[PDB]
Amino acid sequence: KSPNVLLQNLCCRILGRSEADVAQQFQYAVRVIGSNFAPTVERDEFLVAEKIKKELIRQRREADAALFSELHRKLHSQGVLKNKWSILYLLLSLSEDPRSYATLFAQALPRDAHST
């Protein structure tokens, strides 16, 4: 597929309803995926690996934090994914705690100090 029909498939995945019914949300999605689409900042998977470790330390779970290391190794052992940074950032952002802040914690470089 192309991305433009694929965002519709996402709109049909999470909502049960038809795509001729809900088109306001698909319209709101198309604005935000468009015009901020492709990577424009520097990708680094190691910082995201350490932040998946910091999330699993935030649960105080050290065993899966060591399981994540061999999974993170296996992702590079196969090497059939174009953006390793994206899916780990994505999955880290979508975490849910069964049962902080980030103005002291330093992120990636934006390539706004570097020419595009």
Add this chain to the structure above:
Amino acid sequence: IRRYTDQRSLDRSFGLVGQSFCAALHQELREYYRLLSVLHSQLQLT
């Protein structure tokens, strides 16, 4: 701009609103360095 920041950050009685003024002289120095980075990247031409 920078001599004043060099003085006020080593002046230990300048208040906390004069030391907020001097923090508005920190933001526009860090932005200056961002600009200079953009310049240097485009030199790797006159």
Add this chain to the structure above:
Amino acid sequence: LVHRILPVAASYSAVTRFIEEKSSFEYGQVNHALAAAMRTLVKEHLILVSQLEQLHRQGLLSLQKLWFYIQPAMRTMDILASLATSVDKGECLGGSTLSLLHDRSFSYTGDSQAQELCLYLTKAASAPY
């Protein structure tokens, strides 16, 4: 230009010597708890230089990029070294260095970069008391 960049390394060494020496039981549980929270920021200092290593390996970094990149963490380590020197000079332990931190918390308010930092350090060190 190199001379301008040199003071932050002294403001690293002063911090790590503090973290070694004043975590001992002669210096009290609140200094233990404070050194346990400044330990996190040393790790966060390692965080940046790893990414910068990755970029320098990729055939690209200059001194002017570097100088800009290290500015937000340049202020932090300055605050850390000053605070550790202040705790050393009075030999503050126990409740004296909850008096000092109660003062320092009001002392830094401006720019709000350091306000979060000192607030986290005083909330972290205050548990045993």
Add this chain to the structure above:
Amino acid sequence: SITQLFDDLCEALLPAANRKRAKRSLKKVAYNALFTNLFQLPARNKILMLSFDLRVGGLGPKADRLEELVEELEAVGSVLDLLVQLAGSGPPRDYFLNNKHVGRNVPYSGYDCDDLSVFEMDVQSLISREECLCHSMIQETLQVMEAAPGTGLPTVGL
């Protein structure tokens, strides 16, 4: 009838210069292609995918205008379905955007300097035209000054 209006459509795509009898024969190719389809997702999502195709290529307010114009078009329904099929079938600045010296209550964002680089392309496009002109005048004369004689004149060829 409608069979006359297909020939009017046949008259529109013909520019004026036989030549009314070529028309009635092109009318047959129009009928032979009308029944090829007859032999062998609402409207508004199709607007969203092309608005997306715009927005990835930059130029955000232009998508924001196309959606506003089809909004009052959704307030005749069969003709936009034709318009989504034809796309590229034809022929193959203001100082209130990137300026803060003017405005009334102008906001602040500091410098961007990544549209200043597309403000140098704003000059490179002007230079690419006025170099294409000097490419299109030395060629149209070298094609006539170089040949055997009698290639620019039809009357010598008789």
Add this chain to the structure above:
Amino acid sequence: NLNAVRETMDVLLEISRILNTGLDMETLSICVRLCEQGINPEALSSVIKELRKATEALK
């Protein structure tokens, strides 16, 4: 009412202009009245593209 159906067709003209069709004002008026009869637009997409090609063989 003929002023309203005029302004809506004018709005119809511009969104087919920036999508860069070859249809002009009169071809759009023809196509709108042909679609109003009940003619399938999916076939009109074929007959216009064939007619514009066969026109160039005459010139």
Add this chain to the structure above:
Amino acid sequence: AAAAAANLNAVRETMDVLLEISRILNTGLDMETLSICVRLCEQGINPEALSSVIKELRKATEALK
């Protein structure tokens, strides 16, 4: 041929590894939605953009229930 199925195997492994990652952080998404997300991430996309969309679209289905 055969190598065109061997690479299908080499991605069939990775789709399990990302599934284990996804479940130990526990998204409220399953394998089929995740296939749309990996299809999106192959062409190149910002997770800061996509994740916000997912946070909005989940607040559209319990507003019609």
